Design a protein around this ligand. Structure first.
Ligand SMILES: [Cl-]
Ligand SMILES: [Cl-]
Ligand SMILES: [Cl-]
Ligand SMILES: [Cl-]
Ligand SMILES: [Cl-]
Lengths: 204, 106, 289, 755
């Protein structure tokens, strides 16, 4: 209402200002903690790199050009160097949600406990998924991509039809080197993979 | 220096964060007191003067603890940057040394 | 009535071919001749600054008062000459970059063990640092301060510094006049303007870097001052409605982005504080659609 | 309203009982009651709420419609509140109307409770009976309201006052946020509907010029559809079309019959305002603080205009889904929602929408950055206006109130002064001639504080001033003074909004409703548990730019992604539902992975084509042009700003877009190099020249990409692809010897003269 005492409002609203400074202290701690944790994680990598950089210096100074022999077995018996090919995907899985937001989420209304009726179903499906199903977006997109892929594959065929030796030891190392790239070649619910397959059909 | 970074990582930043979580719990009790004390006292004028005093003190404290912890974080990032700068220089010299060696064999 | 195609003499393959033939000696000579022509343009600009010395000094301290700013502007003479001559400098410097970039790529392929040592030595005093830079620019390495430009522009110490400072002011307050020029239109096919004003980004930066090295001032500060005044002057025409003066307003705004992208002394954060990116974003949209 | 809008069917999740011969029959009903009982309590409380709200609203309408009380003053702010009451009844009725889930969940519970014989009071039995009846009946809240109003004599006069105020406010722009704007139209509409009935007739009230139907008709034609709740829209003219006396009076209405120019203006205003705003971004003068006050209000109004534009377009599209006749690419088999969203926008419409969204969000950032300056200048200006008006401006009318015998006017003028005046001395000046009755030979220095009045102070002052200008108290006041009160009353209208700047900013830029689709989901009747991404507005808008690679729009694409932030914040703070956040997050998780793929793919392709063009012989280019076979130069694009993004803020995450793009671009570089070397291996020795050219294009590509991205050194990339890192001779060297041995030596003929 409007009938409250002036000084009483002043004191209450000043008490709430001190509460704001309390929450701001917690908010500040969370911010500084998230930044610290990343920089701290970098420290482990920096230290672990610095030691690798230092013991390489030693290994490199001890290299002898006069001594070093070249082996053709580096080609046939040992694998080719591969640099890291790791890619980050699925960046919004629940486990990436920061604590502050996770706390706000936990006080929001949970859905009705419909999974208690799961064991009484004929279809072995989960009861809650008939109420809310986050995996729906991907399931349908994957399905659409697969169907669109087949539709284009059988449209290229629709248009195509209604139209028309013991002399050098290095040779063996290369010959076997080719076999370890043809036979040793090819020895998924990933968004990139699925998108690649859909595009790859529009070329082959 | 490695020692400056050790101080920041293991002691000063955890210390500054602890002081910040303490500020969170303490000011919640301070706010409670200021609100209750005013309601509970007949001497309202003195109670408000006390709230005013706790407000100013609280504002000054929070600003200080944030300023201190921020300055430490910036110092930590400045040190880590210069670490990578020196390391790149060191890696580059190794790379040049390997290049030289591979050419000598050739 | 041109008898030649400029692209067949100035593109990447051609400049690389030139560098193969001329080498470091030849390309260094080519640049020295380019720098001579910039010296002549600079000497002419200083004349125009001295001719406007009174108005320019007042404009430098009256930057916060708009009524007398627009009033002082009308008292300036030969503004078109200032822009024209800085564009020419920028054009010559744009050609040098092409030359240097080609030389760099030719050397890195011909003398990689020497280039490696030069790159390391550059990446890790103010008179001693020029000797590192002359050896670096000889191998086509881009330098923050151009040694050949410093030499060419070295040809009363307190008086010279003022003229340099006032040149920056002269240029900054003149930039909005470019918006009335139909040729100031930015083109996506060019990634620049039909009248070469994009080359001003290179002129403004490199001339400031050179002059304030010779006069031992602060390059960062003088360019920061320049940007503040440039942004201010250009923001003023944003409220203007005249179809003549604002025809290429948005294309001229894009210069500020180019100046900051080109300058190692200027940051996007600093740009944001005096010229909000949303204006540049909308400007890019206007010219690309 | 939130409870209803977010009520998804529980019974659809319940395993049904097929016959009386089911083994788990009892357990199902048992568990049904355990789940549904807490939900039925909410429905009970809702039944009870609407009942008490209608009774209370009508009790207040009765009170204000008393014979002589009808001839008395009623506060504008309160009439508006009564307007929001009738809209609340419309909202709740329509949400209840569309929600079969609610009815069906109660019946499922009711069926379960009975087949278990749970012990219930005679109170509980009738309670349960009332709810069944309530949920079974369509338009029940509207009907109850209509019966309880029409029993009140003269009720239409009060409603007419409410309507006339809305018309007045809408005409004279007495609103700030888009929701306020739309509320006026919704009150007009349902107001007229309620006035047109068995007892009252709106066409007769128009004949007496009590209301102005023509003006309402004009507004409804200009703006035909506005949001009612969530994705549930209201077609304003529906209130007209279904009113008691519509059929006989069809001729009176033009609103019952049924973007390029828009964008020119928006882009101009954006240019004009933001240019000024940027310039303004020891104490200042009254004029300087006032100017910042003016800008704050101007910028909020502009943001509101833009947001209203976007939401009104969207709102219109939702009630007018397209078909094959209007869109050749839209099949008759396409479901309503996809016809309402996806197919209902041309390429040009989608670009224009992202523009405005970007212009809103961009200006929102600049306004937010200026908050502290604005807060201070607004407080100074509001204080100064209120004190100058109370201490100084009210002297003359106060003098004339005491000089004559006008006690009533004196008492209110004094009460105002008592409530707000902050005298510099601490006390009111008693030596004041005007306070006595005689004129001045007198000067008061009014203080300058950076603090506004309290909401109660402002309410009291405004309401008391209003009563003076509403024998009435108005006729007993002078000419210039009446204009002075009106002046201050009009200007003080926005003070609360401006004092609460931060909250007002958000309300002027609210685009959170583009994602929500509970109404359309309910209409699918269990067929859909959600809609796929190609029907989702944020993704429609975002993917369109990725797919077209539209250069002019590439710097806008993150702004359409940011719509997910608006919706997720709304779902967590306003809807307060976990399941809605769960769904937005899962949509973002999917769409963002696609965003990174499509963006990285086109960026690499763009810089490869650039490299290929840069190194293509110029003479050959011109020769091909003359031969009528121009090798078409690639269009330039604007990818750099995206490449510079190190911290995209999305759903509380900090996303390093640069790092993610690099991961893919680096893989693309390696794949290019592998292909170049593999191509050589499948061909004879003469093809080595071609290889060298291709390697050089790859080198140029790496160089162009290295301006923005950090990649492995080109030599390192090349040595790896060439298998020359852990081996002494690479693939190129080994294929050369292979070809020498198998092709060159045995098959070639040297010509010594030509070499
Ligand atoms: Cl020019
Ligand atoms: Cl709503
Ligand atoms: Cl009011
Ligand atoms: Cl968020
Ligand atoms: Cl090829």
């Amino acid at each position: 209402g409007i009938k409250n005492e002036l000084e009483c409002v002043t004191n209450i609203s000043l008490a709430n200002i001190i509460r704001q400074l309390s929450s701001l202290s917690k908010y500040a701690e969370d911010i500084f903690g998230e930044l610290f944790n990343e920089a701290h994680s970098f420290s482990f990598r920096v230290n672990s790199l610095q030691e690798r950089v230092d013991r390489l210096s030693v290994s490199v100074t001890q290299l002898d050009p006069k001594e070093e022999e070249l082996s053709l077995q580096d080609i046939t018996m040992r694998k080719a160097f591969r640099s890291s090919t790791i890619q980050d995907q699925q960046l919004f899985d629940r486990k990436t949600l920061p604590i502050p937001l996770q706390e706000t989420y936990d006080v929001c209304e949970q859905p009705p406990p419909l999974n208690i009726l799961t064991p009484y179903r004929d279809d072995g499906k989960e009861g809650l998924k008939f109420y809310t199903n986050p995996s729906y977006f991907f399931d349908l997109w994957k399905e659409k991509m697969l169907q669109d892929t087949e539709d284009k594959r059988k449209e290229k065929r629709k248009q195509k039809q209604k139209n028309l030796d013991a002399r050098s030891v290095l040779l063996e190392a290369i010959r076997k080197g080719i076999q370890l790239r043809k036979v040793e070649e090819q020895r998924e619910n990933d968004v990139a993979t699925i998108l690649s397959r859909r595009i790859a059909v529009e070329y082959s | 220096a490695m020692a400056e970074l050790q101080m920041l990582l293991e002691e000063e930043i955890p210390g500054g964060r602890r002081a910040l979580f303490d500020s969170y719990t303490n000011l919640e009790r301070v706010a409670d007191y200021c609100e209750n004390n005013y309601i509970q006292s007949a001497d309202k004028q003195r109670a408000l003067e006390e709230t005013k005093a706790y407000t100013t003190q609280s504002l000054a404290s929070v600003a200080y603890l944030i300023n201190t912890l921020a300055n430490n974080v910036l110092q930590m990032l400045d040190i880590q940057a210069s670490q990578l700068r020196r390391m790149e220089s060191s890696i580059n010299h190794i790379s040049q040394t390997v290049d030289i060696h591979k050419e000598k064999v050739a | 009535e041109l008898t030649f195609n400029a692209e067949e003499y100035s593109d990447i393959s051609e400049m690389r071919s030139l560098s193969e033939l001329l080498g470091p000696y030849g390309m260094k000579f080519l640049s020295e001749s380019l720098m001579w022509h910039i010296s002549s343009q600079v000497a002419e600009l200083k004349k125009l600054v001295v001719e406007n010395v009174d108005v320019l000094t007042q404009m430098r301290t009256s930057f916060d008062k708009p009524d007398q700013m627009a009033a002082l502007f009308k008292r300036l003479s030969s503004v078109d000459s200032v822009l024209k001559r800085m564009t020419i400098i920028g054009v010559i410097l744009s050609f040098r970059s092409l030359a240097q970039e080609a030389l760099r790529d030719v050397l890195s392929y011909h003398i990689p063990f020497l280039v490696s040592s030069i790159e390391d030595f550059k990446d890790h005093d103010m008179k001693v640092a020029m000797n590192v830079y002359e050896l670096s620019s000889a191998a086509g390495l881009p330098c923050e301060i151009d040694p050949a430009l410093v030499v060419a522009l070295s040809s009363s110490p307190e008086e010279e510094y003022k003229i340099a400072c006032l040149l920056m002011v002269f240029v900054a307050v003149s930039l909005p006049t470019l918006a009335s020029n139909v040729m100031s239109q930015y083109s996506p096919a060019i990634e620049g303007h039909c009248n070469n004003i994009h080359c001003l980004a290179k002129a403004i930066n490199q001339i400031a870097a050179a002059l304030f090295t010779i006069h031992k001032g602060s390059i960062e500060d003088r360019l920061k001052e320049f940007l503040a005044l440039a942004s201010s002057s250009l923001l003023k025409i944003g409220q203007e409605t005249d179809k003549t003066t604002t025809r290429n307003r948005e294309s001229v705004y894009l210069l500020l982005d180019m100046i900051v992208q080109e300058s190692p002394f200027l940051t996007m954060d600093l740009l944001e504080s005096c010229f909000p990116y949303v204006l540049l974003r909308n400007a890019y949209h206007a010219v690309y659609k | 309203a939130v409870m209803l809008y977010t009520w998804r069917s529980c019974s659809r999740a319940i395993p049904q009982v097929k016959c009386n011969e089911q083994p788990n029959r009892v357990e199902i009903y048992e568990k049904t009651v355990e789940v549904l009982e807490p939900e039925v309590t909410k429905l009970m409380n809702f039944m009870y709420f609407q009942r008490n709200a209608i009774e209370r609203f009508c009790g207040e309408v009765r009170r204000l419609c008393h014979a002589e009380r009808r001839k008395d003053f009623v506060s504008e702010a309160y009439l508006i509140t009564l307007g929001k009451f009738i809209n609340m009844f419309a909202v709740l009725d329509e949400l209840k109307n569309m929600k079969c889930s609610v009815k069906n969940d109660h019946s499922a519970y009711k069926r379960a409770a009975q087949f278990l014989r749970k012990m219930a009071d005679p109170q509980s039995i009738q309670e349960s009976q009332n709810l069944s009846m309530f949920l079974a009946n369509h338009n029940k809240i509207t009907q109850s309201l209509q019966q309880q109003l029409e029993v009140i004599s003269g009720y239409e006069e009060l409603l007419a006052d409410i309507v006339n105020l809305c018309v007045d406010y809408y005409e004279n722009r007495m609103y700030l946020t888009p929701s306020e704007k739309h509320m006026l139209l919704k009150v007009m509409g349902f107001g007229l509907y309620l006035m047109d009935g068995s007892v009252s007739n709106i066409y007769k009230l128009d004949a007496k010029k009590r209301i102005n139907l023509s003006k309402i008709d004009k507004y409804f034609k200009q703006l035909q559809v506005v949001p009612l709740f969530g994705d549930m829209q209201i077609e304003l003219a529906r209130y007209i079309k279904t009113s008691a006396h519509y059929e006989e009076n069809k001729s009176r209405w033009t609103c019952t019959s049924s973007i390029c120019e828009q964008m020119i203006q928006i882009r101009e205003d954006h240019m004009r305002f933001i240019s000024e705003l940027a310039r303004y971004s020891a104490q200042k003068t009254d004029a300087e603080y006032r100017k910042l006050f003016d800008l704050a209000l101007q910028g909020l109004q502009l943001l509101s205009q833009w947001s209203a534009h976007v939401m009104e377009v969207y709102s219109w599209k939702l009630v007018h889904p397209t078909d094959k006749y209007s869109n050749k690419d839209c099949p008759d088999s396409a479901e309503e929602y996809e016809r309402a969203t996806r197919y209902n926008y041309t390429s040009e419409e989608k670009f224009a929408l992202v523009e405005v969204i970007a212009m809103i969000k961009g200006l929102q950032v600049l306004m937010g950055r200026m908050e502290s300056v604005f807060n201070h200048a607004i407080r100074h200006t509001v204080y100064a206006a209120l004190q100058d008006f109370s201490q100084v401006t009210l002297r003359e009318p106060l003098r004339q109130a005491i000089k004559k015998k006008k006690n009533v006017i004196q008492s209110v003028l004094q009460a105002i002064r008592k409530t707000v005046c902050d005298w510099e001395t601490g006390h009111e000046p008693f030596n004041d001639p005007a306070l006595r009755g005689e004129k001045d030979p007198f000067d008061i220095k009014v203080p300058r504080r950076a603090v506004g009045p309290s909401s109660t102070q402002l309410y009291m002052v405004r309401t008391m001033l209003e009563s003076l200008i509403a024998k009435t108290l108005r006729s007993s006041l002078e000419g210039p003074t009446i204009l002075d009160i009106e002046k201050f009353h009009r200007e003080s209208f926005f003070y609360t909004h401006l004092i609460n700047f931060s909250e007002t900013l958000q309300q002027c830029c609210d685009l959170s409703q583009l994602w929500f689709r509970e109404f359309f989901l309910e209409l699918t009747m269990g067929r859909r548990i959600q809609f796929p991404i190609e029907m989702s507005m944020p993704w429609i808008l975002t993917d369109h730019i990725l797919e077209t690679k539209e250069a002019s729009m590439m710097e806008y694409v993150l702004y359409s992604l940011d719509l997910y932030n608006d919706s997720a914040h709304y779902a967590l703070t306003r809807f307060n539902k976990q399941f809605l956040y769960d769904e937005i997050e899962a949509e973002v998780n999917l769409c963002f992975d696609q965003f990174v793929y499509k963006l990285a793919d086109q960026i690499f392709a763009y810089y490869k084509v650039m490299a290929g063009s840069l190194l293509l012989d110029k003479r050959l280019r011109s020769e091909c042009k003359n031969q009528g076979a121009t090798i078409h130069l690639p269009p330039s694009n604007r990818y750099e700003t995206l490449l510079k993004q190190r911290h995209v803020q999305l759903l509380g995450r900090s996303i390093d877009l640069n790092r993610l793009i690099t991961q893919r671009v680096s893989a693309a570089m390696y794949k290019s190099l592998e292909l170049a070397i593999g191509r050589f291996e499948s061909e004879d020795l003469t093809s080595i020249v071609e290889l060298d050219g291709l390697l050089e294009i790859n080198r140029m590509t790496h160089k162009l990409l290295s301006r923005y991205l950090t990649l492995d050194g080109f030599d390192a990339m090349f040595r790896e692809a060439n298998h020359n890192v852990s081996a002494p001779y690479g693939r190129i060297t080994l294929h050369v010897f292979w070809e020498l041995n198998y092709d060159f030596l045995p098959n070639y003929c040297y010509n010594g003269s030509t070499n």
